[PDB]
Design a protein around this ligand. Structure first.
Ligand SMILES: Nc1ncnc2c1ncn2[C@@H]1O[C@H](COP(=O)(O)OP(=O)(O)O)[C@@H](O)[C@H]1O
Ligand SMILES: Nc1ncnc2c1ncn2[C@@H]1O[C@H](COP(=O)(O)OP(=O)(O)O)[C@@H](O)[C@H]1O
Ligand SMILES: Nc1ncnc2c1ncn2[C@@H]1O[C@H](COP(=O)(O)OP(=O)(O)O)[C@@H](O)[C@H]1O
Ligand SMILES: Nc1ncnc2c1ncn2[C@@H]1O[C@H](COP(=O)(O)OP(=O)(O)O)[C@@H](O)[C@H]1O
Ligand SMILES: [Cl-]
Ligand SMILES: [Cl-]
Ligand SMILES: [Cl-]
Ligand SMILES: [Mg+2]
Ligand SMILES: [Mg+2]
Ligand SMILES: [Mg+2]
Ligand SMILES: [Mg+2]
Lengths: 156, 155, 165, 165
C-alpha cells in the first residue's frame, strides 16, 4: 500500500513532491503515467492517438489499481485518473494527498519552450474530484518543495 | 522539407526507423504527437479529456501542417493522423514512407482478444496509408538497419 | 531450474527475445531488471544515480541467485550481472544462451535511449563499445550457447533458440 | 542586447526564471538549450550522445553569439557555455544574473528528468560536484548581479531580480 498517493493538477507537484517524499520516507516513487506506458510498452500518446479516451482510461484504471494494490512506496496519479470510476472507488482507504495550486501558478510551473483558459476548465473538472478523494490537502502555491514535503509528513 | 515522413501501424517502426534514419542522415526525427504538446504546452490526454477527440484532430492537423513545412529532417506521424482528410491532403508531394507490417508481428513488437482489435485498426488505416505513401516497405521480414538503407538509397 | 538465461550486451534483445521466447514455450518470463525495479520500489536509473554500480550489483546478485533457484521459466539477465563473479558462479549448468551483437547494431538498437545508465548517452557509442570490451569475454565464458542476433529478426532468434533446447 | 542573461548551476533556475522573468518584463525568452534543439532539429541528450560535449560546445557558442547580438529579451544561458572562452568574452558588459543554488538542492531539482547529459547515469551527486567545481568559478568572474535561489521560490526570485534591474 503506498505510503502516500499524491494527486492534483498538472504542475501541482506530483513528481517533484513525489521524488522528494519518496526519498525522505525511504521508498521509491511510482508514477502511473510511467507505470502505464511501461507495462504496455506504448507511449500514452500511442494509446490515446490509437484507441481513445475510453480504452486509455480503462487501461489507466487497471494499472493504477495494480499499483495501489502492490506498490509500497509513493504513488503519483496520472492527472485525469480521478475521472475514471474504478479509480475513485480504489482510493477509498488509502492515504490521499491533494496538492492545491491556483490556476495562475499552475500555468506558470507548466511553461516549456489562452492556454490558461484551458487550464481553468481542467481545474473546474477535476479540482472537486481531487477534494472528493483527498484524505489531505496541502496548499502548494507559496511553499517550496521542502516545505510541502515537511507539511505532508508532519500530518503523516 | 522532411527528407522522409514515416507512417504505419503501431509496431511498424515509425519511431525506431524514425530515429535510425535521422541519425543515419545527420538530421533530427520530429514526432507529430511530440509536436502537439511541444506546441500547445498541454498533454495529448489533457485535450482529449478536456476538449474533444475530434477537436484534437483539428489541433494535430495544424501541427502536422506546420511540421511538414517547417521540419527538415525525418517526420514521424502519429498513426491516427490519417483519418484527417487535411493531413492526407497535406502529405501530398512529400516523401512518405509507409512502413508495412503484419498484424501478428505488429502485435508482437509491442512490449511486456487483442489481435482482432489491431486487425480492425489494420482494416481502418491500411487503406489510408497505402494511399498516401510514395514508398511502401516490408518491415515484416526485413531487419531494421536494412529497412533504413532501403529507404535511404531511394531518398 | 530455469529454462534458459539470455545474456549479452545491451540491445542484444534479452528482454525482447526473452518475452517472445517464453510466450513461445508457454512459460512466464522473469527480466531481472524489471525484478529489481519491482523489488526495491524504484527504477534502475535512480538506483544507479544515488547508490551507483556496486550497490546495484549487490542487489542484482541476490535477485538473480533467487531467480536461478525459483524461476522455472526464462530468465533474461541484466547486462552486467556476469560482471559479479558471484553470479557467474551460480550460472554453471543452467542453459546460458548468449545473444551475440556487433557494436554498431547494439548502439543503434538502444534507442528509447532505453533509460540505460551505463549507456546514458553522455557520449554513447564510446561507452557501449567499452561496455562491449568488458562484457563479451564474460558472456563467452558463462555461455553454453552463442547466437548471432545481427542479421536475424526476433522470430528467427526465438525459433533458432527453440531448436537448440 | 538581453535585459538579463541568467547563468547558474544545473538546477538553479536558468530556464525556469527565464520564462517567468520574460513574462514579468513583457519581453521574449531565448533558452539556448532550446534554441539548439530547434536549430539542429534534434535534442540535447541526443547531441551529446552522438557528437560529444566538445562539439555541442561549438554548436552552443554559435547560438550564444547570435543571441547576445539579436536578442533584447531574457536570455537563459546553456549551463556550460561559460566553459568556451569565446563565450566568456562575448559575455563582457552584459547584465549577467548569477543564479545561486546548493549542491544539495541543485541535485534535488535536477532530479526530475529530461536531458542533463553531463549529469547522466551513475553517481549524479558526483557528476554534479565535479561540474560545480568546474563551472561555478566561471560564473563568478562573468556575473554582474547574483541571486540566491535556495530557500526563495521562483516568483520571489523574479521579484528579487526585477527589483534590481
Ligand atoms: N512547490 C513547487 N515550488 C516551485 N516549483 C514547483 C513546485 N512544484 C513543482 N514545481 C515545478 O513545477 C513544474 C511542474 O512540476 P511537476 O510536479 O512535474 O507537475 P506534476 O504535478 O504534474 O508532477 C516543474 O518544474 C516543477 O519543478
Ligand atoms: N524491422 C524491424 N524488425 C524487428 N523489430 C522492429 C523492426 N522495426 C521496429 N522494430 C521493433 O519494434 C518495436 C516497437 O517499434 P516502434 O519503432 O515503436 O514502432 P512505432 O513507430 O510503430 O510506434 C521496437 O522495439 C523495435 O526494435
Ligand atoms: N534481433 C533483433 N532485431 C531487430 N530488433 C531487435 C532485435 N532484438 C532486439 N531488438 C530491438 O531492440 C530494442 C532493445 O531490445 P532489448 O530487448 O531491450 O535488449 P536488452 O534487453 O538485451 O538490452 C527493442 O526495441 C527491440 O525491439
Ligand atoms: N526557486 C525554485 N523553487 C522551486 N523550484 C525551482 C526553483 N527554480 C527552479 N526550480 C525547478 O527546478 C527545475 C529545474 O529548473 P531549471 O529551470 O531547469 O534549471 P536550469 O535551467 O538551471 O538547468 C524546474 O522544474 C523548476 O521547476
Ligand atoms: Cl498531471
Ligand atoms: Cl543491458
Ligand atoms: Cl545546466
Ligand atoms: Mg508530472
Ligand atoms: Mg512509436
Ligand atoms: Mg533488457
Ligand atoms: Mg537550463
Amino acid at each position: 500500500a503506498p505510503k502516500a498517493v499524491l494527486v492534483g493538477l498538472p504542475g501541482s507537484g506530483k513528481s517533484t513532491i513525489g521524488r522528494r517524499l519518496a526519498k525522505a520516507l525511504g521508498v521509491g516513487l511510482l508514477d502511473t503515467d510511467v507505470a502505464i506506458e511501461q507495462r504496455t510498452g506504448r507511449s500514452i500518446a500511442d494509446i490515446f492517438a490509437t484507441d481513445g479516451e475510453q480504452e486509455f482510461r480503462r487501461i489507466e484504471e487497471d494499472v493504477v489499481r495494480a499499483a495501489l494494490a502492490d506498490h509500497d512506496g509513493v504513488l503519483s496519479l496520472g492527472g485525469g485518473a480521478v475521472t475514471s470510476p474504478g479509480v475513485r472507488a480504489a482510493l477509498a482507504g488509502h492515504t490521499v494527498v491533494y496538492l492545491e495550486i491556483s490556476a495562475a501558478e499552475g500555468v506558470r510551473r507548466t511553461g516549456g519552450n489562452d492556454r490558461a483558459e484551458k487550464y481553468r476548465a481542467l481545474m473546474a473538472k477535476r479540482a472537486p474530484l481531487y477534494r472528493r478523494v483527498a484524505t489531505m490537502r496541502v496548499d502548494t502555491n507559496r511553499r517550496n518543495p521542502g516545505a510541502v514535503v515537511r507539511h505532508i509528513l508532519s500530518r503523516l
